[PDB]
């Protein structure tokens, strides 16, 4: 097989149609399902796969207590075909408390980070064998995307960060070929803090929309050149900002170069993508907490920072139901590259005390050139019944 190139144009998108739902928490109340968080979707040439960071335990288990912590030695990257829930037959592809995965057209690359907070190791596993590794450079929680990496002509790119993720000092873009790190570029341009990037092929380059945990409620953007390893960065212009927390839409502002300095602290992993001057994006419906989820197009929102003209809104999860991380993934069609996204539906501790565990289900949506209706697809488990 030849390497992927993603050279087809982006599909026409009128909104997103429902694609898949794992029902993991509902199934957990009567079966052996893995405790997970930080899920993501990625697809090979034929099939989409669901990935998640396991907590080394099933949900109906003594070890599911205190599973709110994000880093432990037992976290492993789980991998299944999309829609197959994480049952005991699930493969642990690597040891990882932070990860990214992608298929280059020949084989899967997994970027797997584990070890001490102060001195972590990133392992590069390709075609089922460990090919390379790199140690923490800022000695303060080396971490990556928690979503798919992107490969063009066999050169995969992954965004990685360390410390408080400050600009060129902490964030690096690694260029990887068949698991070997071939180049490493420091972050460049005006993005001040860059974490948990959601990346999509935008041939000839890769584009990433990220989380700013310190200054912006507007999201950072990275443009990555595959041919010369050059890096450019900025923020999503849109006056309707994508991060959580953020200011109310009636009072929020944004900037194309700088963080908006409005509810800059903290964030949530999310996504956005360009459609000429317009921007498609998803965010939690609630402005201060991860409740509900909505997607919409903002007219001129990729280039005009004063624009707040939204259209094509869809509620994916109603404003009363818990959401979580969300990320883009790209699927190659017959004549165009489609954009799809997943929403993590987090349940349990800290916000729900009925249970001792923290875990997620997922719902997955794909861009459509056709027409669609309305709905709400929340997790749907009753923690009052599966109560401790």
């Amino acid at each position, epitope marked *: 097989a030849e390497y992927r190139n993603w050279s087809k144009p982006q599909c026409g998108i009128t909104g997103f149609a429902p694609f898949s739902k794992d029902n993991s928490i509902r199934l957990s109340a009567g079966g052996d399902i893995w405790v997970t968080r930080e899920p993501y979707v990625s697809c090979d040439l034929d099939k989409c796969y669901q990935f998640a960071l396991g907590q080394g335990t099933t949900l109906n288990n003594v070890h599911s207590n205190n599973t*709110v*912590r*994000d*880093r432990t030695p037992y976290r492993t990257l789980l991998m299944n075909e999309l829609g197959v829930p994480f049952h005991l037959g699930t493969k642990q592809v690597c040891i990882a408390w932070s990860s990214s995965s992608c298929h280059d057209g020949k084989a899967w690359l997994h970027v797997c980070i584990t070890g001490d907070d102060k001195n972590a190791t990133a392992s590069f596993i390709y075609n089922g064998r460990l090919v390379d590794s790199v140690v923490s450079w800022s*000695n303060d929680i080396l*971490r990556t995307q928690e979503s798919e990496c992107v490969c063009i002509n066999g050169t995969c790119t992954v965004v990685m960060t360390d410390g408080n993720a400050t600009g060129k000092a902490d964030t690096k873009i690694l260029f990887i070929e068949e698991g070997k790190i071939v180049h490493t570029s420091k972050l460049s341009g005006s993005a001040q803090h860059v*974490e948990e990037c959601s990346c999509y092929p935008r041939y000839p380059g890769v584009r990433c929309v990220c989380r700013d945990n310190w200054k912006g409620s507007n999201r950072p953007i990275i443009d990555i050149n595959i041919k010369d390893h050059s890096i450019v960065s900025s923020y999503v212009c849109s006056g309707l900002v994508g991060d959580t927390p953020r200011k109310s839409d009636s009072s929020s502002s944004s900037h194309c170069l700088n963080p908006n300095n409005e509810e800059g602290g903290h964030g949530v992993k999310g996504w956005a993508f360009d459609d000429g001057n317009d921007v498609w994006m998803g965010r939690t419906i609630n402005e201060t907490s991860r409740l509900g989820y909505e997607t919409f197009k903002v007219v001129e929102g990729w280039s005009n920072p004063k624009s707040k003209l939204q259209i094509n809104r869809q509620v994916i999860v109603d404003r009363g139901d818990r959401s979580g991380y969300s990320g883009i993934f790209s699927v190659e069609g017959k004549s165009c590259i489609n954009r799809c996204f997943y929403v993590e539906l987090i349940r349990g501790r*800290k916000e729900e005390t009925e249970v001792l565990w923290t875990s997620n289900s997922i719902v997955v949506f794909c861009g459509t050139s056709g027409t669609y209706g309305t709905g709400s697809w929340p997790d749907g488990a009753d923690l009052n019944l599966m109560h401790t």
Partner: antibody
Framework: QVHLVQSGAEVKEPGSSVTVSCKASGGSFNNQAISWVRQAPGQGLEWMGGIFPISGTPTSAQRFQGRVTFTADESTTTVYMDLSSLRSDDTAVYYC?????????????????????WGQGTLVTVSS | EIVMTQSPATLSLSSGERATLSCRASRSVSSNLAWYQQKPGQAPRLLIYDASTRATGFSARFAGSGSGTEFTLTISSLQSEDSAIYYCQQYNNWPPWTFGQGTKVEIKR
């Protein structure tokens, strides 16, 4: 019992630097974050920053992000706060304090970052 | 980021009266609120955490209550030792950990 012992009062000239220390009376530090809070004369409390004594992740408020750094050592069982490029206005009592918080989650941030135990408060004064 | 407003600025009541102090966050802090007592010339001391759990150093006469955006500290039957600056402090999951400007308590003997 764990309680904090601080470095004696300090006198410094403007533009200089000061090292303030905070030592555990219990012979060891657990991973509960040691934080620095200051109090200018006749004014309220102001959090400057902190560090976890074992896991090492340091954190700083914007008004101190350039001027302040934190370091820790289990052998001396002491956390050291360095304040650099001092000014007359930084004349204040500097208290080290132990937060309930003992882990940083990449995603969710810090639980229990309330100060449970406080040091004697090193009076730092800046003048010619 | 989150601003803490505390009132009254100064409060004065006689011994045996019940004092009430109030604290308001600029945005909801989800019960991540603590209260501190500072007697003159000493380090602050934790009164309350998680908006209502009182610390080992204080008796049931100190009652913390409220949630979301507004909180209150009630001091039942005032005693001579209660004259101190009282401060609220939010710790809603992300820095900075901002304190209230403080309430002076003065016993009207």
């Amino acid at each position: 019992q764990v309680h904090l012992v601080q470095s004696g009062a300090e006198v410094k000239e403007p533009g200089s630097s000061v090292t303030v220390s905070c030592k555990a009376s219990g012979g060891s530090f657990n991973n509960q974050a040691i934080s620095w809070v200051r109090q200018a004369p006749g004014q309220g409390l102001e959090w400057m920053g902190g560090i976890f004594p074992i896991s090492g992740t340091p954190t700083s408020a914007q008004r101190f992000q350039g001027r302040v750094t934190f370091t820790a050592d289990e052998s001396t069982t002491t956390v050291y706060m360095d304040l650099s490029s001092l000014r007359s206005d930084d004349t204040a009592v500097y208290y080290c304090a132990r937060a309930g918080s003992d882990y940083f989650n990449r995603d969710l941030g810090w639980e229990n970052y309330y100060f449970a135990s406080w040091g004697q408060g090193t009076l730092v004064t800046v003048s010619s | 980021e989150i601003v803490m407003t505390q009132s009254p600025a100064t409060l004065s009541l006689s011994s045996g009266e019940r004092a009430t102090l109030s604290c308001r966050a600029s945005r909801s802090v989800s019960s991540n609120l603590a209260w501190y007592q500072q007697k003159p010339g000493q380090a602050p001391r934790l009164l309350i955490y998680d908006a209502s759990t009182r610390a080992t150093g204080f008796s049931a006469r100190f009652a913390g209550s409220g949630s979301g955006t507004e909180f209150t500290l009630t001091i039942s039957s005032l005693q001579s030792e209660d004259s101190a600056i009282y401060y609220c402090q939010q710790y809603n999951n992300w820095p900075p950990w901002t304190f209230g400007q403080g309430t002076k308590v003065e016993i009207k003997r």
